[PDB]
Design a protein around this ligand. Structure first.
Ligand SMILES: Nc1ncnc2c1ncn2[C@@H]1O[C@H](COP(=O)(O)OP(=O)(O)OC[C@H]2O[C@H](O)[C@H](O)[C@@H]2O)[C@@H](O)[C@H]1O
Length: 162
Protein backbone atom coordinates (compact mmCIF):
# COMPACT_ATOMS: atom_id res chain seq x y z
CA UNK A 1 0.00 0.00 0.00
CA UNK A 2 2.62 2.55 -1.10
CA UNK A 3 1.56 6.23 -1.45
CA UNK A 4 2.00 7.44 -5.06
CA UNK A 5 3.75 10.82 -5.24
CA UNK A 6 4.64 13.74 -7.50
CA UNK A 7 8.12 15.37 -7.41
CA UNK A 8 9.95 17.90 -9.60
CA UNK A 9 13.69 17.97 -10.31
CA UNK A 10 15.62 20.56 -12.32
CA UNK A 11 18.08 18.35 -14.19
CA UNK A 12 18.55 16.42 -17.42
CA UNK A 13 15.81 13.83 -17.78
CA UNK A 14 18.32 11.49 -19.37
CA UNK A 15 19.81 11.15 -15.87
CA UNK A 16 16.56 10.16 -14.21
CA UNK A 17 16.24 7.57 -11.44
CA UNK A 18 12.87 6.17 -12.50
CA UNK A 19 11.84 2.91 -14.09
CA UNK A 20 10.97 4.55 -17.41
CA UNK A 21 11.23 7.85 -19.25
CA UNK A 22 8.85 9.86 -21.43
CA UNK A 23 10.38 11.57 -24.46
CA UNK A 24 8.89 14.83 -25.71
CA UNK A 25 9.06 13.37 -29.18
CA UNK A 26 8.50 14.37 -32.82
CA UNK A 27 5.87 12.59 -34.96
CA UNK A 28 8.42 11.31 -37.47
CA UNK A 29 10.66 9.76 -34.84
CA UNK A 30 13.52 12.06 -35.74
CA UNK A 31 16.10 13.09 -33.14
CA UNK A 32 15.64 16.71 -32.15
CA UNK A 33 16.77 19.32 -29.64
CA UNK A 34 15.74 19.66 -26.01
CA UNK A 35 14.47 16.50 -24.30
CA UNK A 36 14.55 14.36 -27.45
CA UNK A 37 18.26 15.25 -27.95
CA UNK A 38 19.14 13.90 -24.51
CA UNK A 39 16.95 10.82 -25.01
CA UNK A 40 18.53 10.06 -28.37
CA UNK A 41 22.05 10.25 -26.89
CA UNK A 42 21.19 8.08 -23.89
CA UNK A 43 18.81 5.52 -25.45
CA UNK A 44 19.36 5.64 -29.24
CA UNK A 45 18.08 2.12 -29.82
CA UNK A 46 14.67 3.27 -28.55
CA UNK A 47 14.26 5.26 -31.79
CA UNK A 48 13.72 2.17 -33.92
CA UNK A 49 10.19 2.75 -35.31
CA UNK A 50 9.37 5.38 -32.71
CA UNK A 51 7.40 7.55 -35.14
CA UNK A 52 3.81 8.02 -34.02
CA UNK A 53 1.06 10.61 -34.63
CA UNK A 54 0.62 13.87 -32.78
CA UNK A 55 -1.51 13.25 -29.70
CA UNK A 56 -0.27 9.69 -29.20
CA UNK A 57 2.48 7.82 -27.42
CA UNK A 58 4.60 4.87 -28.48
CA UNK A 59 6.87 2.86 -26.22
CA UNK A 60 10.12 1.37 -27.42
CA UNK A 61 12.46 -0.57 -25.16
CA UNK A 62 16.15 0.21 -24.87
CA UNK A 63 17.31 -3.06 -23.35
CA UNK A 64 14.61 -3.59 -20.71
CA UNK A 65 14.24 0.15 -20.09
CA UNK A 66 11.03 1.61 -21.63
CA UNK A 67 11.17 4.94 -23.49
CA UNK A 68 7.65 6.32 -23.98
CA UNK A 69 7.76 8.57 -27.05
CA UNK A 70 4.92 11.07 -26.55
CA UNK A 71 4.18 13.54 -29.35
CA UNK A 72 2.72 16.80 -28.22
CA UNK A 73 1.36 19.20 -30.85
CA UNK A 74 3.48 21.94 -32.36
CA UNK A 75 1.43 25.03 -31.52
CA UNK A 76 2.91 26.82 -34.55
CA UNK A 77 0.76 24.50 -36.68
CA UNK A 78 -2.31 23.95 -34.48
CA UNK A 79 -5.02 26.34 -33.39
CA UNK A 80 -5.11 26.94 -29.66
CA UNK A 81 -8.25 24.83 -29.41
CA UNK A 82 -7.07 21.84 -31.48
CA UNK A 83 -3.58 21.96 -29.98
CA UNK A 84 -4.90 21.98 -26.42
CA UNK A 85 -6.93 18.87 -27.35
CA UNK A 86 -3.90 17.03 -28.79
CA UNK A 87 -1.76 17.95 -25.77
CA UNK A 88 -4.38 16.50 -23.41
CA UNK A 89 -4.55 13.33 -25.52
CA UNK A 90 -0.80 12.79 -25.62
CA UNK A 91 -0.69 12.79 -21.83
CA UNK A 92 -3.62 10.38 -21.69
CA UNK A 93 -1.70 7.99 -23.90
CA UNK A 94 1.31 8.34 -21.58
CA UNK A 95 -0.85 7.36 -18.59
CA UNK A 96 -2.17 4.30 -20.44
CA UNK A 97 1.38 3.22 -21.36
CA UNK A 98 2.67 3.73 -17.82
CA UNK A 99 -0.20 1.60 -16.55
CA UNK A 100 0.29 -1.07 -19.18
CA UNK A 101 4.00 -1.28 -18.40
CA UNK A 102 3.34 -1.81 -14.70
CA UNK A 103 6.23 0.43 -13.62
CA UNK A 104 6.45 1.92 -10.14
CA UNK A 105 7.77 5.29 -11.37
CA UNK A 106 8.08 7.46 -14.48
CA UNK A 107 10.26 10.43 -15.46
CA UNK A 108 8.27 12.94 -17.50
CA UNK A 109 8.91 16.36 -19.14
CA UNK A 110 6.42 19.14 -19.93
CA UNK A 111 5.27 18.41 -23.48
CA UNK A 112 4.85 21.20 -26.01
CA UNK A 113 6.51 23.81 -23.76
CA UNK A 114 9.76 24.18 -25.71
CA UNK A 115 10.32 23.75 -29.42
CA UNK A 116 6.58 23.05 -29.83
CA UNK A 117 5.27 25.91 -27.69
CA UNK A 118 4.60 28.33 -30.52
CA UNK A 119 6.51 30.98 -28.61
CA UNK A 120 4.14 30.94 -25.63
CA UNK A 121 4.59 30.13 -21.94
CA UNK A 122 2.64 26.88 -21.61
CA UNK A 123 3.89 25.71 -18.24
CA UNK A 124 0.47 25.79 -16.59
CA UNK A 125 -1.43 24.43 -19.60
CA UNK A 126 0.94 21.49 -19.97
CA UNK A 127 1.33 20.69 -16.27
CA UNK A 128 -2.42 20.63 -15.78
CA UNK A 129 -2.92 18.17 -18.65
CA UNK A 130 -0.13 16.11 -17.07
CA UNK A 131 -1.97 16.01 -13.75
CA UNK A 132 -5.30 15.29 -15.42
CA UNK A 133 -3.79 12.21 -17.07
CA UNK A 134 -1.45 10.90 -14.37
CA UNK A 135 -3.54 11.55 -11.25
CA UNK A 136 -5.46 8.31 -11.69
CA UNK A 137 -2.26 6.24 -12.08
CA UNK A 138 -0.42 4.97 -9.02
CA UNK A 139 3.14 5.47 -10.34
CA UNK A 140 5.57 7.80 -8.64
CA UNK A 141 5.75 10.66 -11.13
CA UNK A 142 8.93 12.78 -11.31
CA UNK A 143 8.73 15.88 -13.54
CA UNK A 144 12.01 17.03 -15.05
CA UNK A 145 12.64 20.63 -16.12
CA UNK A 146 15.61 22.87 -16.83
CA UNK A 147 14.53 26.36 -15.76
CA UNK A 148 14.89 27.49 -12.16
CA UNK A 149 11.73 29.64 -12.26
CA UNK A 150 9.76 26.74 -13.66
CA UNK A 151 10.98 24.34 -10.95
CA UNK A 152 9.55 26.72 -8.35
CA UNK A 153 6.17 27.04 -10.08
CA UNK A 154 5.90 23.30 -10.71
CA UNK A 155 6.80 22.68 -7.09
CA UNK A 156 4.17 25.15 -5.87
CA UNK A 157 1.49 23.47 -7.96
CA UNK A 158 2.35 20.06 -6.54
CA UNK A 159 2.39 21.36 -2.98
CA UNK A 160 -1.03 23.00 -3.15
CA UNK A 161 -2.87 19.79 -3.90
CA UNK A 162 -1.38 17.86 -0.96
N1 LIG B 1 17.14 17.14 -21.13
C1 LIG B 1 16.01 17.84 -20.54
N2 LIG B 1 15.57 17.47 -19.35
C2 LIG B 1 14.53 18.08 -18.80
N3 LIG B 1 13.91 19.07 -19.40
C3 LIG B 1 14.32 19.52 -20.61
C4 LIG B 1 15.40 18.91 -21.21
N4 LIG B 1 15.59 19.53 -22.38
C5 LIG B 1 14.69 20.50 -22.51
N5 LIG B 1 13.90 20.53 -21.44
C6 LIG B 1 12.76 21.40 -21.20
O1 LIG B 1 11.50 20.39 -21.43
C7 LIG B 1 10.51 21.07 -21.93
C8 LIG B 1 10.04 20.46 -23.29
O2 LIG B 1 10.73 21.10 -24.32
P1 LIG B 1 11.04 20.25 -25.68
O3 LIG B 1 12.05 19.16 -25.44
O4 LIG B 1 11.49 21.26 -26.71
O5 LIG B 1 9.67 19.52 -26.10
P2 LIG B 1 8.50 20.05 -27.08
O6 LIG B 1 7.34 19.06 -26.94
O7 LIG B 1 8.13 21.48 -26.79
O8 LIG B 1 9.09 19.98 -28.59
C9 LIG B 1 9.25 18.71 -29.14
C10 LIG B 1 10.09 18.88 -30.40
O9 LIG B 1 11.25 19.38 -30.11
C11 LIG B 1 12.26 18.27 -30.08
O10 LIG B 1 13.12 18.60 -30.95
C12 LIG B 1 11.42 16.99 -30.46
O11 LIG B 1 12.26 16.03 -31.30
C13 LIG B 1 10.42 17.42 -31.08
O12 LIG B 1 10.68 17.71 -32.52
C14 LIG B 1 11.03 22.53 -22.08
O13 LIG B 1 10.60 23.28 -21.02
C15 LIG B 1 12.55 22.37 -22.06
O14 LIG B 1 13.17 23.68 -21.61
Amino acid sequence: HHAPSYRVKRMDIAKNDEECVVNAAAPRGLPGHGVCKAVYKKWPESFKNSATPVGTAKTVMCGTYPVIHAVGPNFSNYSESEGDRELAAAYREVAKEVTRLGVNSVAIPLLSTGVYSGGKDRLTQSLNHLFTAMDSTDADVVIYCRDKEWEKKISEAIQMRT
